[PDB]
């Protein structure tokens, strides 16, 4: 079990990062690389890389 929510919003300025607002659920699949992990949008379904400091455990 590893569900993290976005504590803040973010506008993906690239085709790699993602876009969402506080309250959006995210599935952190890999969080070992730099400070950016790859989460999967449970709503849209597209995966991307978001700031790890912008998400926290349920």
């Amino acid at each position: 079990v590893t569900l993290f929510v976005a504590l803040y919003d973010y506008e993906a300025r690239t085709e790699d990062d993602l876009s969402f607002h506080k309250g959006e659920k995210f599935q952190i699949l890999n969080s070992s690389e730099g400070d950016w992990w790859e989460a999967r949008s449970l709503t849209t379904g597209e995966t991307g890389y978001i700031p790890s400091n912008y998400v926290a455990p349920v």
């Binding site: 504590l7 803040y8 973010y10 730099g34 400070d35 950016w36 700031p51 790890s52 400091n53 912008y54």
Partner: peptide, 14 residues
């Protein structure tokens, strides 16, 4: 390079 990391909204401002 060093991940940018959008600094949260200042020190919890507003």
């Amino acid at each position: 390079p060093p991940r940018p990391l959008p600094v949260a909204p200042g020190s919890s401002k507003t």
